[model samples]
Target: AYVTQTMKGLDIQKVAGTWYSLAMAASDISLLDAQSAPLRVYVEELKPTPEGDLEILLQKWENDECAQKKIIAEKTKIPAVFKIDALNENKVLVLDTDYKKYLLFCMENSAEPEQSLVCQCLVRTPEVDDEALEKFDKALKALPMHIRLSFNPTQLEEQCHI
Candidate 1:
């Protein structure tokens, strides 16, 4: 319910395998391949609420632009699993991969020894407009107001080999 510690030494990759990649996004929606969405393991975006509980960002499984497909599908209320690379203390990065590894996600309380899931980010698709990301945003926009995040997976080294 509260974050008392700082994420100064948070090693996001260590738990990369343990957590899920339920989210994928790109600050730049123009490039499809650059989209950083978790297609492997889905994760819930964790956010602290004023009520003292955590809000979850629900994630979903969808098509990867790396393959012969277009990403614009938000299926599954509960995601499977995925991985992420680019991240900060507050958010994780996701993207399409060629190796087919676990989807990536930036998690909350990652520096804490016993941090657990507080929120679930509903799965999202490759959005060409604000409308697409809104699907997930709308859900979040309901109860609590939190930060909206998106990234380009192509920036990560792990996602480059593909």
Candidate 2:
């Protein structure tokens, strides 16, 4: 994993809502681009387990279909943090987000740490501020990694109805 830090003091309730997958930088982009239809992830709920982890059920929209996926993620309150799972990895760093708007993540394939890291930016709306993109680009570059960047400005408007 290329990331060594995560966002702190995030409100789970505020983050628990519909989110649009706007831009993504990853080791693999074909999988995301190969979707026969538009794509987006709808976070239905966030519940805490006795183990102190969080259980989130989300609807993944693609190929004109919505698939339900459940994820058990690690959470930390020392600074209100959460982890995003990637291939064989449990803790992808969350760079930043407003919960009502956008989220940027740094991801890596734990099985292949030698591979370059991936970054994904999700927004609640179809539009993204130019300022944010500029900063995100700088951040992505600062990591000194090779990324396959993709943005679906159109898909941002397509909502998943399940």
Candidate 3:
């Protein structure tokens, strides 16, 4: 039985769109190119929050990519949307933009949304288990902000009782 707290959510159809980060906010030009290498990352531990906003260790996102080795600029809250598309194979894709069609690409930790990087993948449910996730967690915890430490899970767990 695969238990998942995250759902295949693309509900905010209005917000579930594509997006591009402010040019100044992103890294070098590589951030725009899709062929950029996968940041070789892993698991994100989530705990549900009281208010229900999905607070993550999200860095900057430039065209559906998360910047790697970057921290949250206190003054630079860079424009980003918080829409989730689909959740499958225990993997949920989040779109970071200002609620539009262009924001829908994929999600990641803060600063890792550039082309050269992908967000640190977090395998919370039982379905997503792999060596990558294990290794990812270890590395994620070692980052500068250690953004790995976050508020809590956004979604709740539901069971299909029969």
Candidate 4:
């Protein structure tokens, strides 16, 4: 069976902290290209709200500068799922996480005609271990959409100071 199952009984607080985008795969190849890659943001922090929602702090390099963005992901009926009304993303799912090491998640882009999917692998640090990579691969393969392109965003970490 595909490993798209969300983490069981996820404690949002446990995964709340700084995270680095180690890898990303998108159904649309152009989204992973040089000109558009910056849109695949890095997770700076995740804060759980008192109301059970999630506050996501993200950072991205744009126009020769680093920009910080914030978005609130409303809690869904499922503990591991969230509804976010961001740029192109509308739904977010927490596929897997070890809390201390890595996190794997997927987002659905409603802006696209066919609702393209984007999966991301995030680690507590910029460099990811083999085990994390293996898990990320498994999650990617489980997605319904075929990955058109995948790339590492960790190298761009140095450019953004905050």
TM-score, prediction 3? 0.24
What lDDT tens digits, residue by residue, belong to model 2 across residues 1-162? 433344445443444444444545554442234442111243444454544555556556556667665555565651234454533434445565553245665444355532434554545532544333454554433343343444445544554652
Q: Per-residue lDDT for 1-162 in model 1, tens only?
A: 222122222222212222222333322222112233232223333332332222333333345433211111111221222221222123322221111222222233235411322222323234222322343343222223222343333322132124
Q: Residue-pair clashes per candidate, as listed?
A: 40, 0, 32, 0
lDDT of 3 by residue, 90-126 (tens): 1223332222111222233333443322333233323
Candidate 4 residue 95 C-alpha distance from true site, Å? 0.5
lDDT against the true structure, per candidate, is 0.27, 0.46, 0.26, 0.58
Indicate which candidate wins on TM-score: 4
Better of 1 and 4 by lDDT: 4
Query: Which model, 1 or 4, shows the larger TM-score?
Result: 4
Give me the displacement of residue 115 in model 3, in angstroms. 3.5
**Cα lDDT over the full model 3:** 0.26
Candidate maximizing lDDT: 4
In candidate 1, residue 155 scores what lDDT? 26
Ranking by TM-score: 4, 2, 3, 1
Best of the two (2, 4) by lDDT? 4
- Lowest summed-lDDT stretch of 10 residues in model 3? 17-26
Give TM per candidate: 0.22, 0.55, 0.24, 0.71
lDDT of 2 at 51: 41
Candidate 2 deviant stretches above 4 angstroms: 1-5, 11-13, 27-70, 77-87, 99-101, 109-116, 125-132, 139-145, 159-162
